[PDB]
Each structure stands twice: as C-alpha cells, then as structure tokens.
Amino acid sequence: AAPYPLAHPPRLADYLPPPPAADSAAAVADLGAVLEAQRLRTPEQVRRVRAHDQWEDNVFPFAGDLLGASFDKERLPLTRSFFNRAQENLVEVLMPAKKHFARPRPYEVTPKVKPVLPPPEGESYPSGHTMDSYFKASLLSMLVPEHHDAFFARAEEHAQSRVLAGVHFPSDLEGGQTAAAALVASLLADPAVAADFAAVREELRGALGLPK
C-alpha cells in the first residue's frame, strides 16, 4: 500500500533529543531498566511477545478486542486503506531518524542482554514499533474518542513489550511517542488526507453504531 503523497513530511531528528550519551546517568538507568525487565520476564510473557505481528492490517489486531466484532478488516475498506497507507508514511520518516541517530541496541552495549525478538543491528532510537503503536492510538482516539484510554493503554502494552523483549531502551520508547505526534499532525494537516480521514470516521462510527 502506498504512502499519502505528503509534500513536507517531518524530519524526526528536528523533533527528538539525542539518546543518552554512553557515559551518562540516563544511559545507566536505560540499561538497568532493560536488564531488570530481562530478570523479571516469564516464559509465557516471552512466548506472547514472539507471536508474529503481521504488518499489513495491523490496526485490526491492535484494537479488535477493544472495539467489537464490527471492527472487521473485510467490512471496513476505507479504514483498512487509511491505516495501511499512513503506516508507510510512518516508515518513510522513521528510517532516516534511526539511521541518523545511529543508536547501539541494548545487546550491543553489553552481551548480558539476551534479546528474544530477532535482534536488528544498531539503529535503536527511536522505536518504530512504539511510534506506530502511539500513532494508531492517536488516530483511533480521534475517530472513537469513547475509547481514548483503552487505545493509549494498548499503545503502552506494545511499547513496553519491546523493553521486556530487550530490543529497545525506555528512552527509545520515549522518542517513538514524540515522533508519532509529529507524524499525525503533519499528515492530518494535508487536506486530501483530512478528507479520507473524515470518511473513515463515518464508515467506522457507522459500523459501531455511534453518533455525532
């Protein structure tokens, strides 16, 4: 699916701080938090996080148990399109940011860190999974304000899952959170995108039989 033809997407580096410096107190807490999560994680927590999250219609698994059985991929063509197209806009701004900040992953600072997701090479900051999670919660909360907290608590479950997994530092989650906002604001300022989103609102609220 194709990104929305954004004219001026955000350069995330202008929106985020640098990650902690290797020698900083922040860097020690970051690794602490990742090691503490490794100690505490259970085999069932580890199994659940390794469950394959397919990327195509990922908003459906993200909020299906929150919204009803009415939230059907196959019954919501506009919603399903909008989320796949904006996902690719997410990926277009995220790649440059990762590459730019070039942060070493937890398990590249010490080999004490045994990641349980297949570990990528460097480019730890920001977390694109955290960015995508808060991105969906932000859009879904605009469309269905009635479940705002349920969406944002789900975004936090997904975000932490990456620390528990050992592929991200808490500060990586913090950068993904900030990035999601910049993207949502950039994207929804485009009037053709604002119009597709106004249509998604009618499809989705309609399907869940909600008013206004």
In order, the DSSP letters of 102-169 are -PPPHHHH-TT---SSPPP-S--SS-HHHHHHHHHHHHHHHH-GGGHHHHHHHHHHHHHHHHHHTS--
Is 192 in a helix, a strand, or coil? helix
Burial 15-36 (b: 16+ CB within 10 A, else e): bbeebbeeeeeebeebbebbee
C-beta atoms surrounding 192 within 10 Å: 9
Contact by Cβ (8 Å): 112, 35:
yes
Burial of 150 from C-beta contacts in 10 A (0-12 / 13-18 / 19+):
middle
Angle between helices 170-189 and 128-143 (to 10 degrees): 50
Helix or strand run (H / E) with residue 180: helix 170-189
| Resolution of the experimental structure, in angstroms | 2.8
Contact by Cβ (8 Å): 176, 128:
yes
Method: X-ray
Give me the number of domains the chain comprises.
1
Q: How far is CA 104 from CA 62, 97, 109, in A?
A: 28, 14, 7
Query: Could you tell me which of 48, 16, 20 has the C-alpha nearest to residue 169?
Result: 20
CA-to-CA distance for 121 and 177, rounded, in angstroms? 22
Domain coverage including residue 64? 1-212
